[PDB]
Amino acid sequence: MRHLKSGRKLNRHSSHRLALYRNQAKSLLTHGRITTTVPKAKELRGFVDHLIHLAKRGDLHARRLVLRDLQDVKLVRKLFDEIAPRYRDRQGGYTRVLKLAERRRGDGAPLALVELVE
Amino acid sequence: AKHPVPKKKTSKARRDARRSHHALTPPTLVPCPECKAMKPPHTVCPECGYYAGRKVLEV
Amino acid sequence: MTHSMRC
Amino acid sequence: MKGILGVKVGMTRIFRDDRAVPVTVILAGPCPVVQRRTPEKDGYTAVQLGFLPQNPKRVNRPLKGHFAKAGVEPVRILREIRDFNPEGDTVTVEIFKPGERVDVTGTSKGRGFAGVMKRWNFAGGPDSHGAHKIHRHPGSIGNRKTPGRVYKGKKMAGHYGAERVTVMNLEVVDVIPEENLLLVKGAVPGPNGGLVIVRETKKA
Amino acid sequence: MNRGALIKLVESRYVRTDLPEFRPGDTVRVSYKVKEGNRTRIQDFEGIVIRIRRNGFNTTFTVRKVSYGVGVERIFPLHSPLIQKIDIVQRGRARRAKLYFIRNLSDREIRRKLRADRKRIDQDRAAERAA
Amino acid sequence: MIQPQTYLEVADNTGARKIMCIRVLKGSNAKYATVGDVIVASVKEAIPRGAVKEGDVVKAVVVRTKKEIKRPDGSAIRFDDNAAVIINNQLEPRGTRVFGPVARELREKGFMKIVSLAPEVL
């Protein structure tokens, strides 16, 4: 049973899955848009949305909280100076997932794009 | 355990009856409103890159 | 594997 | 023989006569009478109750006609209460008085595919002393060449729950008509938000 | 509907607001109404609050005390009608929410671990100066 | 929650110090005993020259349990030991003092003399 349980497992143990979210978060904030599998993309939304929101708050505490996940002061600077002001008046919903039409050849996996919002 | 084993060869009739559930369903495709190419619903059009009215992707 | 012994 | 459709709200407890009383709160009323089953027409006696108003932007034409013949707004659920013939056109919580006893029918929580130990309280096997991969297994399921088969009704693993269950003879602790609320002592089948049915008890 | 509010509405007839605020590590005296044979008397129970589990109207708290050589723990519904009053006997300063570890401590180890919460003590004396 | 094999402290002056439950005298097959229940016990440790000695098979009523017991008012109580008082076949204590608190449940179960002898009743 899984009754009212939140959060995918993605066939990874607890530290692999966490490192998976951090590395996707680093990649999406680096490039603005990435392709993954649909289930990975859907989980990345909330993980990134929380980090963008903290950058919107912009204080030193919020920068240190984000650096636990993102580690790269350069990237965090970009998130605070360039990315976060884009969303000052947007209350959540900083990311979007759109499904792609063609599966990956080698395992048939449904793919999706994840991107930051305008 | 003690290694269970087919007692009889399955007949052609019985083999094929088991496969009565094996036909594929053809893919569900809708026409893309922009370029009219057929594509899976709820996916970014792979032919012109449009979805929800706007360009999204480079093809 | 030791055979079963019906002895 | 009165009854009413309801929703399981959730459990809490209250204090009555220096005693803690566990209760399940049920939002029951109100239930428009939509159809009456008559011995002349239907062969038996019952009321078709409605419950929860529905967006007409979701009620097809076969259903809209049915509601229309009764002059009722469209409701989300239609359920019959057998051998209930209320005088009015609407059933509310006020048909129950604190102190009466009720039976409550709900859809139990679904365990999906359940093992023999959870489904049937089987004992399993030993967890050591040489037990070989059978710690949760049922053991023997029969005899030998006579009868050479397994009884119908044999308890085995399989789906468990999400089935109709009636818990019988619960006390009505309070009726809060302003809020269409029913307080019932004890536990009631199903999840919060699930549909239940509250009937006057059959125990004497 | 809102089921949470309906439950809170059902419970609102029994919620109390006359009791003092306290924290795990505080020393408290609970005047509790007891039924003994035929009569009902108020029996006090004084000890250390070692746990408060919160759930709105359903929050409860646990008080530990030594009595004639034997440790006694007593669990109280925080909104029970059988509680006459709660008297703050002392503020202690804890570092965690649950104080189960004091079951295995000596009486002087407990005193060294839960020193007086001088701040909340001064805030108590700061109030009670009403006029 | 006392069962066969459970050791219990003796909260009286009968001389016994530790008894081990061998039976829960509550029906045909009760699994557990709680405060107010009677057990049969073997005396595992005693002080010399007392009323009861090591090896005696005795009856005792349970007066304290580490498993907390619940009460209709929604409260519960819990002691640090499991304790019993040795009794005779009329439920009367075979000692003359009871040491430590006892549960108020003993009262309605018919153990009034033990309740009065107790220094505190909780």
Added chain:
RNA sequence: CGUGAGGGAAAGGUGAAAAGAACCCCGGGAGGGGAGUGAAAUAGAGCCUGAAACCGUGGGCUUACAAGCAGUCACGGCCCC
């Protein structure tokens, strides 16, 4: 295959003649479709003949209340000559 003494296989056939298919077409290739050769190409090299098990496509009759060593006897229905 065996350290070794030693053990010890499978595997023949286009056509009279290579005339062994230039060139074009789809394809990354494989493979094919035309063109061409030949008396013949289901003789096209994975090549004489090309059985049987086995697999498949198309058609006729039949089958979802039914008890079977699967046939046999009878009668009826449908399809074919």
Added chain:
RNA sequence: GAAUGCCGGCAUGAGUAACGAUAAAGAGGGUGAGAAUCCCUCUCGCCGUAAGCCCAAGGGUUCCUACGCAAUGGUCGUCAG
């Protein structure tokens, strides 16, 4: 027509078990008819009295480079002993 016969072919089990250490992956860029699987870059994880380095046996071109992908590689393959 039977010899648990012999040699070969082809079925059934079955789209089933399995795909060989639970050290672990993610993304961007590139190449190509084709890329989860090749190359490059960043992020992550694992060994570190080794899962690193140097000899001796044994193996015998497997070394380096260009061109390849039918088969071999337990998938794929543009990569490769």
Added chain:
RNA sequence: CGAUGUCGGCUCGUCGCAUCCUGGGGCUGAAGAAGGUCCCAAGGGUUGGGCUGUUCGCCCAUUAAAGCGGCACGCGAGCUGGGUUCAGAACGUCGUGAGACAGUUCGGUCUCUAUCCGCCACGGGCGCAGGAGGCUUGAGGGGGGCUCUUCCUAGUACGAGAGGACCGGAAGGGACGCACCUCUGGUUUCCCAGCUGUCCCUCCAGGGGCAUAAGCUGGGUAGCCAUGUGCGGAAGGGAUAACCGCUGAAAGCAUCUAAGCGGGAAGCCCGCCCCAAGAUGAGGCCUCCCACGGCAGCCGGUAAGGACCCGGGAAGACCACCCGGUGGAUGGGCCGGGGGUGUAAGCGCCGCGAGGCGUUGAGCCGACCGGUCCCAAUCGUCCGAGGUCU
């Protein structure tokens, strides 16, 4: 004998009744209470331990009782392997010996993949003369079915006394069953905190990895849960068993019977709970659609409707089921509440310093109860009646 695994145990049942208990009875050398004996009765129940491989049995402590048998001495493609039942070794014994012993002693490989029937669950198909969306009847099944203690009646009837009822009423238990998470008590793989060693970011400060597939430790929401909570066994109606009668001949009397009529069990039927019209005997009611175009058929286009796809769900292996799809709160974000942790960072002050204090119940914060269109359920596609015959 081209193999039907062989004791005991564990697990899982099911059946017989020559009945261990509970229910109903007759006789008693039945005053009462408690027995003895036999009859009816298989609905349910029939405990935990010490010894031994043990079956059995003896013992301890209880109990209403601690029943006896069948199912390949039920059940090793379900487990065990103590015994028995190979090879080693030893003792007693026998044999000159090699060796031998239902004599003993210590040790000794128990085979991942279920084809068919059967069983537990779940889909797909077609049928149920028009086609649909709902709500239902219940043929027929299944589940369940136990019992004790105290009190009142009443210290009454009975009894010299000891003792001690029927009938009727009341309360409280044991085990078992279904459901449940308010409370109690668990778990809660990252929800919070503290801690060590090391490497790293960025030197301090603050952090991150790794030490497990949580490094360790203290806590812990929702969910899933029992040790926790509610509720169940019935009541009642009907027909009976042994047994007891009423009226009553044959047979002037007698006779429960030959005509007829009563009473009478935990058992039987119904009643309770669950499944259930593939109940092909395919049921009933309410509502909706409609006679489309072309040579009981045909083929196309539609109707009421349905499916697909997508967002999901205390529903779930998959499928099914249920909700929702911008006319929207379905998931994700965000916000408020709850809840957990237990006073963040930064700065100021005190201390040589480890630290302490204030800011501050601070900061962080899964799932719970809600709000909010900020993000995604875009756009659509495909089926789908024209109703045989007297």
